[PDB]
Structures are given as structure tokens and as C-alpha cells.
Amino acid sequence: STRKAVIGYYFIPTNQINNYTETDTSVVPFPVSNITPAKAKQLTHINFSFLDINSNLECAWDPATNDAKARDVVNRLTALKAHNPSLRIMFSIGGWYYSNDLGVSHANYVNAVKTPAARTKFAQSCVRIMKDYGFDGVDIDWEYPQAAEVDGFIAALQEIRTLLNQQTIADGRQALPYQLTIAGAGGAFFLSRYYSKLAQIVAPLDYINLMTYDLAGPWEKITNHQAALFGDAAGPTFYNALREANLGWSWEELTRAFPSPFSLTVDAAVQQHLMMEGVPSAKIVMGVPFYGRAFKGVSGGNGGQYSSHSTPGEDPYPNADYWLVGCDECVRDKDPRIASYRQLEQMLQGNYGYQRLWNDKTKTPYLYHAQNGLFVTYDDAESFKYKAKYIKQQQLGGVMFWHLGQDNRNGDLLAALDRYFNAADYDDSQLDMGTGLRYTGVGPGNLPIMTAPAYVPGTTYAQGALVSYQGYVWQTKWGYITSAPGSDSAWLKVGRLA
């Protein structure tokens, strides 16, 4: 019973920093003061976002940033630590806008990690920004290094870790050591870019915060849940790209690890991490969305699930038709495709025509607007019970979420996560996790415990025979085999001894 991490992004754009105020929500909708002492206590980390990498290949604020206002906002966050001596204010470098393959700063990420000298300079800039502004650690949210750049990225994290460790010693911060995290891919297509080197990536980290949300969106042909915990056989499935990663595994090893097609769920991403040797469950943090994704143009029959739709994917949103009925924040932000949980409660409570439905396979809620043909996929305090139960059962490190401003005013989502993990009186021992589709892949990092008769030399084993030998349970790939398990290619390591 180590405390689960509870990691909340605090995102504030440059224009809001530069006009920062705590008394006008039309300029800053979500000021630091909305994070009350009670919320501060429920959080373990706050990820201040986003810093960038500049063309000097250093960690830097957006250069339009007013530095005194920036320091002041950051000081308000670090003052929160007075209510909670476990609390850290991290900062994040990257995000989609800055760091995506076509993002505005993308070449800076590539070049910052490309060579030994560039990495030294970058790493030093991170620690220096951390100490100058009073942050408690470094989060990297590069979406995403491509297979060629992965060795540099790894080396960059290793170097940052060493510098963080020096800093923790210099400041005598062993009670709350400076930390290093990344925001990891939560679906196999991006994950496949660095999957083969996952143990190396995770080794220098305190946590890898899986972005296990945005698993559906307007870029797909068919509506779906953006953060299904388990799979729905009625729903779409996807090619498992991990089976083409450069792993050096055999056909049978790849097949047993990477079923395809597969359901793109939270459970899949988590298992895909656990399958790798050297990736410990305690370092894996499950991301959850504090917002819904909305689609229009959907047909009926199944609550708007798994339907074609007409939601534009362009960015910025390409006209002024704000068709997400009742969503006032969408008008403010000029995009009807995303609604905060905060806004969604209001849409459901007003006379706007939505029903709240529940998929008992995915263990996630959804809104359906029968009259206009709208579907919204989001998470709430109910879906979080199952996700928290899963976090406990799988011995994950905790939960991360984007983002704090999207909680409702009383902070019920955060409170709920804090309760499912820490409340003495909350009991989920009978919470039924459903018959949704589990990801069944097995790999070297997550072998099940098994028993079988001991291997006997001289015996002819038929295809599919199971024996135990030198700590493991092995299975013949064909028959008849007589070789000692592990000595040639005929035997598959399927389990570990009892």
C-alpha cells in the first residue's frame, strides 16, 4: 500500500499567463486559486504545461511569454505545497502543438537529442529551468520520437536523470527527490515507434504516464469510445502494429504477444507495456480524460456507437457551426469537438436533448442526442471505479489526467479518484469488472504462473505438450520433440513456475 500517484495537468496558454488574473474567468477560466487545499491534498503531482524546446536546442518558455507573470503563476502553484508535503509541481516540455511530426518546434526535439553535445546542453537547460522557476521535476511530452531518434531520446532521458540526481543531492531533497516522467503513447500505432526499446525508455523514469485516451476521434471513420477499459466485440478493431516492431522475435512469439486485429483499449496499452521485460508495473500510470470527444452526423440503433459520422478533423475547426448543443465552452473555444466533463454535466442537466448511456463491456459512459445525431465519449466517476480497480489489481503506479480545468467546480472527478484509492470506507471488492474483451497477449515480461509435469529426457512430446524445466513451463510448437526446452527453437516459453 504505497500511495498511488495522482497526476494532473495544469495547462495555461501564453496569452493567459500574460494577462493572468484570478477574478475574471473570461480571461483566465481556471486560475491557480481554483485548486483549493482539498484538491492539493488529493493530487500527488501537478504537471504545469507547456514549455518547449527552442532553436538553440534548449528547454525554454514560449518567447512571447511575460517572464514576471510566468514566475508569479508558478509561485502560486508551488505555494500549494504548503497543504501537502507529498505534492510536486512538475513542468512539461512538448505537447501535440509543439512536438507532433508537423508541429511548430518539431525539428528542435529531433536536434536536441541527436548528438552527445546537444543532449548535454538540452539536459542542462531542463534542470536549470527547473531550479530557476522552482519546479519539482521534468516531464517530457514529445509526441513522438520516431524509431531513428529513439536512441537519442533514451540517451537524453538518461542524462537528465543523472543531472536530476545530482540536484536532489545538492538540495538534500531525498524526502521528495526530483523526478522525471514522460507522457507515453496509449495506442499501438504511435507506441510502435519506440516499443522495442521500452525498457530503456522507462528505466530513467519515475513514471511513464500512458495517454490512454484519444483512442477515438474525428480522424476515424467510425465513432467509438475514446478510452474504453475493455473491448466491445460490436466495436471496431485495429491492426496490431507492434507485431512489425523490430523485436527479433519468432512467428509464435509475435503471435502470442500481439493478437491482430485487436480492440484499442486502456487494458491493451497497459498489457502491451507489461509484456516487455524490464518494464515494472509500478512505473506505469494510466491516463484518463477529463473531457469528452463529440461527433455529429451519427445514425441510430446503438446509441450512436460504431457509426459513420461527419465530424471535421481539420485544426483549427474549420467553420463557425458550433453544433454541440448546450456546450458554451465550445463557443468560447471555437470547437464543438471537445467538451470538458464540467460542461458535459451541464449539458446533461439542461434541456438539450442528450441521454446518458453506459456500455457495460467498455465500462464507459456516453451521451447520445437522438434528434440531431450526436455521440459523445467521456469518462466519469463511475468509469473511474473500474479503472481504479484495474490500477490496484494490476499494481500500476497510479493515474494521470488531462486536465485540471476540465473537472467540475467541486472537483468531483479528482475527489473520486482519491477516494477509490485512499478512502478507508470505499470497498470495490465486489465491483464486477464485466465480460468485455481482455487483451490476451503474453510476452517475456508478463508470463503467467503455471504448473506442468517435469520435462523428461528421452520422451517424445507431441505438439502442444507442456513441461516444466529450469524455472519455466514450456510448450512444444510442433511434434515430436525430444530436445531439452530452451535448447533449440521447438519449445516456446509460455509460463513461470509456481
Ligand SMILES: C#CCO[C@@H]1[C@@H](C)[C@H](OC(=O)NCCCCCCCNC(=N)NC(=O)NC)[C@@H](C)C(=O)O[C@H](CC)[C@@](C)(O)[C@@H]2OC(C)(C)O[C@H]([C@@H]2C)[C@H](C)C[C@@]1(C)O
Ligand atoms: C490541419 C490539421 C489536422 O490534420 C489532421 C491530422 C494531422 C490529425 O490532426 C488532429 O486530429 N488534430 C487535433 C489533434 C488533437 C490533439 C490531441 C492529440 C493527443 N495528444 C494529447 N492529447 N496529449 C496529451 O494529453 N498530453 C499530455 C492527426 C491526429 C492525425 O491523425 O494525423 C495522421 C497521423 C497518424 C496523418 C497526418 O497521417 C493524417 O491521417 C489522416 C487521419 C488520414 O488525415 C490526414 C493525414 C494524412 C489529413 C491530411 C490530416 C488531418 C486532417 O487528418
